[PDB]
Subunit: 327 residues, 6 copies
């Protein structure tokens, strides 16, 4: 496959070229805004990489890659509204810069624009793309609802948590890879194998996000360190920490304090104290083990793909780099 | 074609049978709720009527008919949020019964469920259905944004108003008819002719809604009489009324008072006084003329369709009944 | 027994004489205010009537009678806060005239002042008075909590409703009568018999309040007609109405609309429509039957009391007058 | 007397055993919650110590000791509502964890449960317990109202401040000791002597709390340092500081700034600057002198009690330990 | 003097000609808006009438007449903000159409523009105009503050009420007349005589407004009937009504209910009931007597002015017409 | 001229003596409060200095000097309301200590009191004082509106910014000097020359305030460092910084974040980062150059005044000291 940097450069050129709606501005200005917040564009690049590895061009896969990115950004726009997020990537969220009604309607327009980007494909690929895309989009809705339901549950199991993050953050990784495979004309059995890789990669990636939310390096315009702790989100780190009967009661008591009932200094003490319980309980290590375990499962999936050994080496290195390890 | 009553009965059976997602309840309970608020189901029945007239069965068109209804209800769910509507058809809106975040996410899930209802069609019809559906859905978003933009404009032309209501309320009428024609295997030229009928019908229907909002018979759990007046919506009735230099200045002055700066009795006096200006200006008659004119255009479209004369008589009668006239 | 009018006159003299705390004004001004809102003073007069019937004087029972009234008013003060009531007996509630913190603290001071009014009794009666008073006060708290719990339950049984109104409104009727009996030196078996009368009377009285809330004559500064309907309170009238499978579904649908999602006219239509369902279902008649049935049970209790036949005739007439019937 | 640690251990066992109401949970769950927030339980242990010193057992005094603690916690529950406190002892307040209406009603239920804990005593002690308890409870209400009244007064005298803290925080110390003496069968003259000790101890203790609010060691989940300063509470420390005509004008000017008109850094500068004025004015020393003076008065009261010299040594040491001094 | 209608016509021409500032629009657009709300322009026309009667022209007095109107409108702009008025003369208030900050700043600009309209006068008249204008403007501020102070007083005397309405509404009537006299070159003794007429006229006019607020004919876009009653304003009508010991207690009790604690129907019942107390107490008649009495005092002032008997007849008729009587 | 310190001492004596209105307290208490917040009283002292330099006494100019200070404080009172300022000079703003309505009405009373302080001047000076005062006051209103208009403009030129700060902060400096010259009997040509000095001085002074807002030394009860940055005020520092095409895009992006969408730490990072862009762009130096340039223009104006060379040396030194330079 081409280098990430080469694919990203082509991708950002083709994005500007294929997303051109401008009028009415009240609808489309926020689409250009959210697509211009930058970053790694991991999801669309999985589509291009999959395509190349299986014999097609980036150029062939490009409209589908752009659908994936438009879709993902549609989810961020509605999610920022539902989560009352003020900033995304150091910039105002769409509903803050404009208004909530703009966020609702523009996000709706982006989901539809994503579907439209499939229309240049032949009838057979068009059908296959729409089918895995729609199943994935509806799964992402279910994952969102599960995550909301967990907010008022005091009894969430690790299996239920892994099912939720699979639907909410991993199926679209699978889907992005599967779409490149569809464009290359690969069969269903092969499509499912690359999909499965995407599931294990996506689960490792999200478990890593759970870990770094608590233990990650602070960035002022980056993700707040200890946001999950402050908001009492029951992530893999917390769920594993409370399996230890020594820490469980005083972890549950920290997770009973709302941040609106607390001063800055109380919130910071809660983050330092809960971080220490995460280490001492074995929860932090159990989280690093689960990330390691999903990454290995993803590497074994790569070994079984019908792609050239170069392609497996590139994918194996990309997977290790994504998980902050070295090649 | 079968009778409306026969099609509606089959439609409500097939709706219950084909929309079965139940878990998670936080996502899908509101889908069953909004689909159970009743009424005429005009849009899906246009799909079934189109199908029958051109040779297919209701049963063949049914999944597409249900897509149309799921789509329309998705738009009502987001619209009720954006318009802060408390009631729909005498019952609490989804965002009032549940919450705004439920309305946002459930509406997203309904748009995706609509797309999925195309999946049993052959690859050729699947392609055609998705294409006219997506273009229609994005047009409905544009119409919504235009209607929002008109709120802060003091200078809206009749042409701009007719373009907005075409996108917001008529293209989906066209689309519902065009989808039945696609299922019957009709060609693009014929599909566009039935689409065009739907445009003229949909414009007549919406101009009728503008008229009845001011002059309609009061229903307590029905549409408020004078809601457009209270909210200073610049509808066809107002736009034509202000063409009269005798009424224009004191109509613009009534339309400058926000209802939040007014007592009940002031609002009622504003409605009675503006209603009288609508009559005396010629605006009310000009609105009835435009409804009459669009209805005639729709009747001429029916005369040119490639359908049996029975089918034209049934459609001609359905069009007159819809516009509160007699056969 | 003396006439109600004679007892009430003595009672209001002794009230002014025995509740004299004035400083600090921020605490005690609201006590004088709430005790001066007038009405029938039913509860304290039951204490005086019980005392006389069993051989003691009004004067002997007076401090205990005043405790009962101070207690009852303490409950109204906290209840007006918890129910967000703006007016009581045509005048501002304590928390509206002053503030919520005044309502909380003054109500606390009134409960304690009630207990103190027992202190002139001999050690034996003091003990008995405190014991039935405290059990009654804690039962009234439980009844309040049950009524709150019923707000979020869709499944309340008639037995659970009768248990709630017994605790919330009837045990204090029983208690007021039992306290007069204690002051007259009557034994526990007799005390319980008059208590039981008070339970049946209190249940009849509250079932009558449920009936008149819907069907009572309007008083502008009196209880709103249809308040229970507007607030979707599941009272005996509603619980019996929904036993009719013909009315049940559209009663439950009316009871799903919050009044904050409705206009005045929608609220008035809901009250007229639900009132009609109450009649047509058999719920209204079943409510009048239950009032009749509790009143008869109370009359039989009177026949078994150890009091002079005069005393039974006076009590029998008082019971019928209270229930808006004739002697 | 037994050791504090031994009495506390027995007390927490007997508390769990004698406070068993669980249904309805909406009423009683918050009672178990507030009684489980831990700490020294000073007030109930004064009751047990008094009992032992005068010849009775802890076991005899236990129900009365538990009444004292239930009473005190009832006051904290209403006080946390009226003061808008978010946390108590590092945990959410009842009105934050549940709601305000829960706090109002559960607190009412706790006052009544306290009264009920007297019922196992003989009629003579029952009478005496209820009488000093009720007088104390009503005095605590008056002290609360005085403290509220001082918020809008610019003219509060040291005598008026000492009278307020006596009613609000000291009479219950007196009362707790007096109740143990009543259970031991001691006479009124002796009961008043131990009561008086409790008054002087309670005044020393509260003057110490005034001192430590400004000058105490910071605890993140403990009492905020400088809360009285931030809220402009006119405590003994401020009242003595303004007797100095050199500091008075700029102290009154600091005490004119609301914390809602200030940034964190302004609040911290106000606390550092006012703390310095407290030292330099002589106010801090005058506060330490008043604590010393009340402690000595309490020690002289101990010398005059009719108890064994051991008992006086234990009480003398307990008094010095409470005031953060050594034996 | 010219007819009111002739003076008003010249006045509205000269207003448009002499108030021409347009940029920046954010400052001056609201000046044109508030000056275009129409009505009788009584105050400026008093200036023109005074001028003519004493020998000058309307044209000479015009800039001063316009100052008076600009001043009066400046007071209405700030008053509408402070009173939270939504409408003025059937149109949105400046702070509702724009914002509060616009109302504050534009009103400030209008006071200054008023002062500037004196600048074409000779140095002697300029001095005299500025002096009576400034004293009047500061008196109007004092009257406003007194009216605010009366809101929290339960003890307002008729003398204090008459002093307040003199400052708030009458001194500017006096001032407008005095300014015309200054322009005609009249001496101080004569200027004070016409001023005094204006005081008695202005007091009659305001007492009439107090009367008509309760008893006036309803106009939907006019002054609310019973606004003073709803807002518990202690006007001459209420102050005289409570002199009757028969009505006083239940009038004070009606005047204790805030309209925010009341339903529409309670407010309407309060207005009907208080109106009846106003009649039956003698308060309504005492108000008509005071209006009659001030009008007669004004007529006697006219008899003593140094003007032609025509001028006295015109002024006498104008005074009677203003008070809704006939010539 | 006398020393600043000598003039300030006389000024504060004469202020206390000439501003004596006390009743009603609700109107005048806030006038005494805002005039007692201290500082340099630059503006009134310019009036006294101008008077002395041209031959009059301080005593002659004093009433006009006090008008200037009363006027300036009137503007601060309304400005603190419109800007929602909580503190002024370390003390609560008038609208926070009292209320907004007090701020509106008291500020109105202060503008009128200012005008009244001209009344002891002879008719010729009275006329000249009123005329330059009123033109200045109306210009200050226009400058305020321009500054408000700039909040919603993305396109503000340096010329438009300099025009706004001239009207908002410099014309009153000119005016204060011109009034002293009028009192000394100087001619219009000379009056305009001292006015012009005041314009250049006032522009230098305000450009210095723009500079020190970003780069000034922090004072806790002083002006917040980086307030203009936090509020995205487009001051000379920002306008010059964005002329550099290297910094412009990321400066505009920082200036797009509202502080309500940011944490403390994000605000502090924004201030540090924007401060660095101000230096590196050349904007900071260009601001120091413009201050230097206006100061030199002011020094040249001093050289051309018709005053004694002493007077020019004193004024030259005062100008350099004001701009934080040395003599
Ligand atoms: Mg994200
Ligand atoms: Mg997540
Ligand atoms: Mg609709
Ligand atoms: Mg519409
Ligand atoms: Mg009641
Ligand atoms: Mg009830
Ligand atoms: Mg505490
Ligand atoms: Mg305290
Ligand atoms: Mg008016
Ligand atoms: Mg008035
Ligand atoms: Mg300033
Ligand atoms: Mg500025």
């Amino acid at each position: 496959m081409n280098t990430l940097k080469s694919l990203r450069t082509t991708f950002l050129e083709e994005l500007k070229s294929k997303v051109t709606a401008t009028e009415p501005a009240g609808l489309y200005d926020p689409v250009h805004y959210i697509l211009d917040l930058g970053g790694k564009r991991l999801r669309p690049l999985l589509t291009l990489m999959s395509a190349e590895m299986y014999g097609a061009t980036a150029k062939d896969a490009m409209n589908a890659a752009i659908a994936v990115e438009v879709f993902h950004n549609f989810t961020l726009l509605h999610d920022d509204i539902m989560d009352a997020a003020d900033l995304r990537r150091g910039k105002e969220t769409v509903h803050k810069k404009w208004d909530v009604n703009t966020g609702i309607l523009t996000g709706d327009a982006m989901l539809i624009m994503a579907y439209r980007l499939f229309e240049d494909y032949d009838k057979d690929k068009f059908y296959q793309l729409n089918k895995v895309f729609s199943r994935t989009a509806l799964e992402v809705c279910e994952g969102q609802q599960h995550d909301v339901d967990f907010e008022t549950r005091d009894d969430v199991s690790v299996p239920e948590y892994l099912n939720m993050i699979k639907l909410k953050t991993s199926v679209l990784v699978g889907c992005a890879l599967q779409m490149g495979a569809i464009i290359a004309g690969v069969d269903e059995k092969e499509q499912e194998l690359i999909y499965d890789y995407g599931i294990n990669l996506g689960l490792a990636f999200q478990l890593m996000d759970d870990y770094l939310d608590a233990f990650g390096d602070p960035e002022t315009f980056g993700k707040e360190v200890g946001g999950d702790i402050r908001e009492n989100k029951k992530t893999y780190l917390y769920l594993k920490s409370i399996e230890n009967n020594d820490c469980a009661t005083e972890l549950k008591e920290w997770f009973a304090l709302h941040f609106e009932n607390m001063t800055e200094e109380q919130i910071d003490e809660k983050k330092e104290t809960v971080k220490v319980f995460f280490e001492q309980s074995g929860g932090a290590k159990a989280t690093l083990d689960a990330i390691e375990s999903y990454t290995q499962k993803a590497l074994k999936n790569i070994e079984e793909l019908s792609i050239a050994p170069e392609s497996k080496k590139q994918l194996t290195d990309f997977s290790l780099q994504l998980m902050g390890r070295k090649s």
